[PDB]
Design a protein around this ligand. Structure first.
Ligand code: CLF
Ligand code: CLF
Ligand SMILES: [Mg+2]
Ligand SMILES: [Mg+2]
Ligand SMILES: [S]
Lengths: 473, 465, 466
């Protein structure tokens, strides 16, 4: 049924956002509201639209200036917070750019301040010729026309290419709106504005993977083994110009259908490129995905050679962890997709029972998926807040929580360990090896001497201090 | 030809900002108050990214709420989001006593009437919760001026105005007020010990010691500010205010002097030996209490340690320092005491007209035997660009968002100020005072020693120093 | 095949890169912790001067130790007159001197000088020359061809306690604990004093080396002295109990006080890590009847909070080698496992393997470890370097500074622990034992790994949101 938590008695609208799955229910009658307005004052986990455009998607690129048109806080706040390595020395993580909007620009306009900032950025780094400009709350409010500025800059500096995104933080309800605005502008303006050499009979784009701790580079070892050219990765370890070539691909493989389904849908509509959704987290999921890709291209035997070798290498370790993680209870409090990519994969491959899930910004689509794959007796929460998290912990008593670091540091006080469900502990987490990495971190998190030590009150005469015996795969 | 020069950044844009915006600093002020949840009126990122920043520095959660400004409020105004946010906080957190209502760029631009919303909420709260008092403080923090440094100072001042307006002047407390500024829990622990050893009763505003909270057998959460409403109200009754940071709380000491005739004493921020000496002399002056022998001893232990380092490893080494202005100026003085040469000081905001009048600039101009460039309105690209152009540095002192500059230039780096997320435990280690000077000097030496080993630069010399 | 904890000796007769110094060095260390004490090292001059230098390397301070200056004549015809003159020259020139441990060396053990006879001669001479002084001369037999500085420390403590308590005997019960922390830093002493103060337990810490970290004072006074007095030592006969923290570094004095004076001795695991600190505090509560205070529950919780930020993220499955004094090696191995490190190689540097095989901590490791552990006894530091050269993969070394070049050349991060730690600044002021010490050790490990990740560009971008 839908759940009114005790901490929500004075915000009872929250009941339509919380589903407890019970036997024999028609789940179509219990789909959480999602992607609706936030309640002020709740300590919702949500962020802003600008985050979704710059931090999550655009900022992944290795060769692009990320020009944040606004006061300096939006830039500061999106710098030193992500783990998306590159193969060019992590340019994307080393730098952030701001137009340093001041009061005079609120009064008189910020367009010349942006234009000056843009030329400064190109002058300071003469090897970089690509830029994305983002609006923020106050530059949207004063109506600066960043597309017009970018047009002038490209006319004046013909060796640069600039893309723009209107994504003030008050737009939409969450980071989701930023994903949409970026995806649709990119396909409208920049796809099919250049072409690259085709070097394989088999071509694809990989859509919705942001190279967290090297996930994209790990999956690329599969594509290289199979002889598949990836025209573009959207956007893990990617380049601006590779993204201009997306129309060339024969197939679009999607992992993050939430952030990046938009551009896969438009590529199908406009160019006829089929959309294949996979799960690139999960051991047996990865095997299904490879088999689908290889069935589409007609390279099935090459797929089976790769799968066989990967199972020989990694399955014994995975199964060692399953023996020790079987029956453990897990919560996932992340953006949305990882709920539906992980609930059944940890159950199948590790024996882990996901007892509570919260999505910051998922749509009803994401809830359809997670409730289809998820367990009975589990809580499914749209736009969860901090007091709800405490009440849910008391209800389901998880052994481990996959969530961000701040929430991990909060639940540590309750002696509940965490794995970073966003940026990972020791990743990558995608692919065959990656699920073994995920399992290792989960194992080390839960079977941790410090948790046992923390429970002992040395003043209690009746108590001793235990020793635990651990293991390794 | 001996010159200390102040100059601005010569670019309009920023690459690699040194500080966050005003609202972030206001949030930091508020999280040091017991039974306080700041309410940040604006878009959601203005809250969530700052809660993350605090988790990076402290490895702890702190509670801050958003008003969740969305598209309708951007067209018609956001007052209803403030009013709802206050009530939703009050209804769900029964022990909540203080809500600084912090504006953002969005809500400053659209002109929401915060004081009008506070009158509405005060009426609503008095009707719904007759036996409760919640203090709503208006905090105006447009992000298109100043920085998190200015926002911290503005929030402290507004909270103090709000609470003291409510309670006024009472009986003399005999206590000092102390505004240390934006410092670590370890700095607070050191100051408490100094006042205890000198038999001086003092409130430290804010008392952030318990930000380093235990993981306890009973699963209790103790990660709170310790400064109470009562502690802030009692500021009106103090013997005197000791303000350690010109840019981080002195304006509250002045306000208490104007309003309640509590005399304010602004001293140099106590980085290094002389600044600590002068702080203790001012405490003695205003209290009539002697400096204890225990502080002479701690001072002497610090000096003994630093003397093992200064002429052997530090003399003539060139240092760049960035961070909050009180920290940068104080650390430049400390550096000089140990024979380091702070040739480049970077201060990260638009407060140059104030920095040009800071008496510590003159103290530098009258002491340094090497040129000093002080770049105000600086970003961290200002440091990287100068190194790329040939500036030879032996050491960087600054916060963790400068790390890649040091790593790529192969320059040892000591983490100071805020945030220091890329090393463990630094929030627990004092930087001010005698012990802090010693700890800083030994961090510098140990960073140099590791660098000598990794680069094979006379690594054999670390035997009989 | 189950994990195995294997003890093995060094397979070479010779030493390359010794882990410890010789017995007389450890006897000198024991003695410099006594107020109004100047040890007198009976042998050649190097046996004194090199050890004064060693103490200056670790502490960055001078300590006073004298030599008998054995020369050719005395090496051939006997050195008693060199002892006897050295005692008198000390007494004449140092009017406040009260205690002289007379420490033998290889030379004076080989030639068979009669130390106890020289002490009778000197007592006669001192009683006649200085009828208003009492100087305690303790015979300390420390041939360097047995044991190590660890055994020489324990031998000197025991001989000094025997000498002083023989003179004073048992008297008024003191109500205090005797505490033998072993060979620890000034910061470890500072921590123990705080623990006893917070638990309202009166205790003497033998030796009290806190003031080795002495101030540079306005009045130019020299305060670099041991704080343990003759009176403190004599009062050990009157204690409620002895708490011995170090099996190889003072427990034999606890045992002697139990045999001689019926002061019950409690040997506990050296308090490295959380459980060992817990169990030390449980023993103090048992013997005193005093409650463990809330302040220690809080310090413990702050340590655990800090270590929890590190263990599964940065430490799990990382392989560690540890070398140093046996109590420290075994205690740090236990601490490492609390934080998910894997101490696969433990090196202990002397001929005391018959004792180490019976150490209960070996059994504690056998019963916990899920990985093989090799414990090399009689080890030198070449035993570490050779294993790395042969392919042992290590993520961390924990040991003293004379192993530095092993770590530097192998490009392995090292945390400096034990004695001597001359190649980093201030470590003597840092606790390693107790809850705060566990936290500071864990944070040293993490910070060493973090710097290494930066220097080697090994996922250095990961140090943002841990
Ligand atoms: S929702 Fe920016 S952090 Fe804010 S007060 Fe403005 S400078 Fe500072 Fe999102 S786009 Fe940005 S992060 Fe907020 S302002 Fe809006
Ligand atoms: S004066 Fe010189 S240093 Fe002394 S012994 Fe003689 S040659 Fe050597 Fe050696 S082992 Fe130790 S330090 Fe001595 S007691 Fe013997
Ligand atoms: Mg000294
Ligand atoms: Mg903590
Ligand atoms: S979000």
């Amino acid at each position: 049924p839908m759940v009114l938590l005790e901490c929500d008695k004075d915000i009872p609208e929250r009941q339509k956002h919380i589903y407890l799955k019970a036997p024999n229910e028609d789940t179509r009658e219990f789909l959480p509201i999602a992607n609706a307005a936030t309640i002020p004052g709740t300590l919702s986990e949500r962020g802003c639209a600008f985050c979704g455009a710059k931090l999550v998607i655009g900022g992944v690129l290795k060769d692009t200036i990320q020009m944040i048109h606004g006061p300096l806080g939006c830039a500061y706040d999106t710098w030193h917070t992500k783990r998306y390595p590159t193969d060019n020395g992590h340019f994307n993580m080393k730098y952030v750019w701001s137009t340093d909007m001041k009061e005079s620009h609120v009064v008189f306009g910020g367009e010349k301040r942006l234009e000056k900032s843009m030329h400064e950025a190109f002058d300071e780094m003469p090897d970089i010729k690509r830029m994305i400009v983002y609006t923020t709350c106050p530059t949207a409010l004063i109506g600066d026309d960043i597309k017009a500025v970018a047009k002038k800059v490209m006319k004046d500096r013909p060796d640069v290419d600039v893309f723009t995104v209107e994504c003030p933080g008050f737009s939409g309800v969450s980071q989701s709106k930023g994903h949409h605005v970026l995806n649709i502008g990119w396909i409208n303006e920049k796809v099919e504005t250049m072409e690259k050499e085709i070097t394989s009979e088999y071509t694809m784009n990989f859509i919705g993977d942001f190279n967290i701790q090297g996930d994209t580079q790990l999956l690329q070892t599969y594509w290289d083994r199979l002889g598949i050219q990836v025209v573009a990765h959207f956007t893990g370890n990617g380049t601006y110009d590779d993204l201009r070539c997306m129309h060339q691909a024969q197939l679009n493989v999607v992992n993050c259908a939430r952030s990046s389904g938009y551009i896969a849908n438009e590529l199908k509509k406009r160019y006829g490129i089929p959309r294949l959704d996979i799960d690139s987290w999960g051991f047996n999921y990865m095997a299904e995905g490879i088999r689908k890709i290889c069935a589409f291209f007609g390279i099935e035997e090459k797929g089976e050679e790769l799968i066989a070798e990967e199972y020989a290498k990694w399955k014994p370790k995975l199964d060692w962890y399953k023996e020790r993680l079987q029956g453990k209870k897990m919560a996932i409090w992340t953006g949305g997709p990882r709920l539906w990519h992980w609930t059944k994969s940890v159950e199948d491959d590790l024996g882990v029972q996901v007892v509570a899930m919260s999505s910051k910004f998922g749509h009803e689509e994401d809830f359809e998926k997670v409730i289809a794959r998820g367990k009975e007796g589990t809580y499914y929460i749209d736009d969860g807040n901090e007091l709800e998290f405490f009440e849910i912990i008391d209800l389901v008593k998880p052994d481990v929580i996959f969530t961000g670091p701040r929430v991990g540091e909060l639940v540590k006080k309750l002696h509940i360990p965490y794995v970073n469900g966003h940026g990972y502990h020791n990743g990558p987490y995608m692919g065959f090896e990656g699920f073994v990495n995920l399992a290792r971190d989960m194992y080390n998190a839960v079977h941790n001497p410090l948790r046992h030590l923390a429970a002992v009150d040395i003043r209690d005469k009746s108590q001793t201090t235990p020793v635990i015996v651990r293991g390794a795969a | 030809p001996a010159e200390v020069k102040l100059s601005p950044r010569d670019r309009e844009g920023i690459i690699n900002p040194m500080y966050d915006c005003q609202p972030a600093g206001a949030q930091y002020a508020g999280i040091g108050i017991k039974d306080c949840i700041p309410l940040v009126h604006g878009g959601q990122g203005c809250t969530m990214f700052v809660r993350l920043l605090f988790a990076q520095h402290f490895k702890e959660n702190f509670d801050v709420a958003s008003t969740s400004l969305h598209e309708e409020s951007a067209v018609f105004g956001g007052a209803k989001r403030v009013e709802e946010g206050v009530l939703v906080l009050a209804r769900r957190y029964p022990n909540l006593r203080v809500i600084p209502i912090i504006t953002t760029c969005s809500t400053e631009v659209i002109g929401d009437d915060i004081e009008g919303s506070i009158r509405v909420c005060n009426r609503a709260l008095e009707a719904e919760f007759p036996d409760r008092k919640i203090y709503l403080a208006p905090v105006h923090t447009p992000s298109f001026k100043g920085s998190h440094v200015t926002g911290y100072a503005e929030c402290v001042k507004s909270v103090f105005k709000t609470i003291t307006d409510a309670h006024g002047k009472g009986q003399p407390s005999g206590k000092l007020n102390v505004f240390p500024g934006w410092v670590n829990p370890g700095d607070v622990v050191l100051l408490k010990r100094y006042f205890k050893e000198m038999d001086v009763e003092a409130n430290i505003y804010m008392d952030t010691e318990d930000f380093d909270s235990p993981m306890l057998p009973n699963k209790s959460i103790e990660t709170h500010g310790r400064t109470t409403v009562e502690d802030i109200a009692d500021s009106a009754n103090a013997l005197a205010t000791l303000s350690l940071a010109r840019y981080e709380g002195n304006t509250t000491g002045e306000l208490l002097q104007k309003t309640f005739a509590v005399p304010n004493a602004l001293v140099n921020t106590p980085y290094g030996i002389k600044n600590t000496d002068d702080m203790l002399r001012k405490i003695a002056e205003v209290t009539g209490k002697e400096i204890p022998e225990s502080l002479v001893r701690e001072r002497g232990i610090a000096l003994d340690a630093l003397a093992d380092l200064a002429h052997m490893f530090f003399a003539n080494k060139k240092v760049a320092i960035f961070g909050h202005p009180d920290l940068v100026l104080g650390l430049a003085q400390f550096c000089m005491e140990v024979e380091l040469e702070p040739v480049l000081l970077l201060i990260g905001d638009d407060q140059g007209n104030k920095y040009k009048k800071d008496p510590r600039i003159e103290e530098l101009k009258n002491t340094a035997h090497f040129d000093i460039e002080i770049v105000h309105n600086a970003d961290l690209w200002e440091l990287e660009k100068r190194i790329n152009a040939g500036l030879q540095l032996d050491l960087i002192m600054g916060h963790s968002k400068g790390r890649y500059v040091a790593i790529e230039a192969n320059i040892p780096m000591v983490r100071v100020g805020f945030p220091t997320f890329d090393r463990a435990g630094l929030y627990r280690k004092p930087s001010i005072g005698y012990q802090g000077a010693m700890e800083l000097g030994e961090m510098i030496a140990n960073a140099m020693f590791a660098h000598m080993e990794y680069t094979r630069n006379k690594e054999w010399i670390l035997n009989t120093w």
